[PDB]
Amino acid sequence: LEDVVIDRNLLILGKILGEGEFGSVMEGNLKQEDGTSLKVAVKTMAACMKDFSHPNVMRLLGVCIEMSSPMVILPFMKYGDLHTYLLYSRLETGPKHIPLQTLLKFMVDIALGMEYLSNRNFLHRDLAARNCMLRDDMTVCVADFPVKWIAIESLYTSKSDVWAFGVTMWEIATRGMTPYPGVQNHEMYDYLLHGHRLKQPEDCLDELYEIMYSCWRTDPLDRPTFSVLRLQLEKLLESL
Numbered sequence: 001l002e003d004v005v006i007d008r009n010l011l012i013l014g015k016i017l018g019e020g021e022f023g024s025v026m027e028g029n030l031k032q033e034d035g036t037s038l039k040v041a042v043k044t045m046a047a048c049m050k051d052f053s054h055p056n057v058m059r060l061l062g063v064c065i066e067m068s069s070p071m072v073i074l075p076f077m078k079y080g081d082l083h084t085y086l087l088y089s090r091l092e093t094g095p096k097h098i099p100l101q102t103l104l105k106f107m108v109d110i111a112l113g114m115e116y117l118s119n120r121n122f123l124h125r126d127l128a129a130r131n132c133m134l135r136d137d138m139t140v141c142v143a144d145f146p147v148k149w150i151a152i153e154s155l156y157t158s159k160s161d162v163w164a165f166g167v168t169m170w171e172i173a174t175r176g177m178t179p180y181p182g183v184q185n186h187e188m189y190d191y192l193l194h195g196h197r198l199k200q201p202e203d204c205l206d207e208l209y210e211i212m213y214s215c216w217r218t219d220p221l222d223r224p225t226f227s228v229l230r231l232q233l234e235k236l237l238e239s240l
């Protein structure tokens with residue numbers, strides 16, 4: 001089924017950007033049909049992605065299969081994963097102090113991305129700040145289609161995706177804290193069973209904590225939809 005394939009000679013691979021599940025993600029140059037070349041990311045060593053068109057969801061540029069003796073091509077995200085970008089924001093090199101409105105925009109971006117995928121009845125199954133990438137224009141898009149992001153009942157529906165989104169909201173609000181400090185992975189199921197949740201971050205609004213807390217209700221049906229979540233975050237952002 002090769003409607004999305006690209007000729008291998010149009011692609012030039014280069015240095016490593018990160019490590020995915022099945023192999024290395026490399027930087028690359030893709031020669032386009034209009035003659036010009038574009039910087040790309042190439043996972044090495046997709047059917048879902050072909051069906052997606054939305055700003056806050058990573059798109060498929062193509063596929064290549066080189067023979068030795070496959071590679072999925074994706075857009076280059078110049079600031080990398082969101083988790084690592086948040087960590088750097090607490091030091092002094094690349095980005096400055098990120099204000100509250102910019103963190104909410106990251107949350108809104110992800111919510112929009114998930115709203116779209118949720119309407120297609122597509123389940124992410126791995127939503128986290130490390131799986132959210134940063135475009136050259138500072139917009140976030142969800143990508144990659146881990147015990148502390150999985151919900152109670154899942155130990156998967158669209159509401160277990162909502163749980164993981166709440167955890168990702170917490171990650172962004174804490175600027176890259178690992179969830180559940182002083183709690184081990186084996187310990188999680190019982191920690192959640194007794195009704196304990198991620199604690200409210202430091203200088204973080206009650207309105208915001210209400211929203212992320214609502215993602216972790218015991219009953220999946222009590223959680224809000226991504227569209228409900230998206231509006232709550234958008235209106236909270238507007239009130240600053």
Ligand SMILES: CS(=O)(=O)N1CCO[C@H](c2csc(-c3cc(N4CCOCC4)ccc3NC(=O)c3ncc[nH]3)n2)C1
Binds near residue numbers: 020
């Ligand atoms: C969630 S994912 O499935 O996308 N995934 C999984 C495996 O690890 C990959 C990863 C980690 S860090 C990184 C990256 C880092 C930089 N940086 C290099 C160091 O300085 C800042 C920019 C620049 C570009 C980068 N990636 C991309 O453009 C790109 N697009 C599409 C897939 N990957 N990529 C990402």
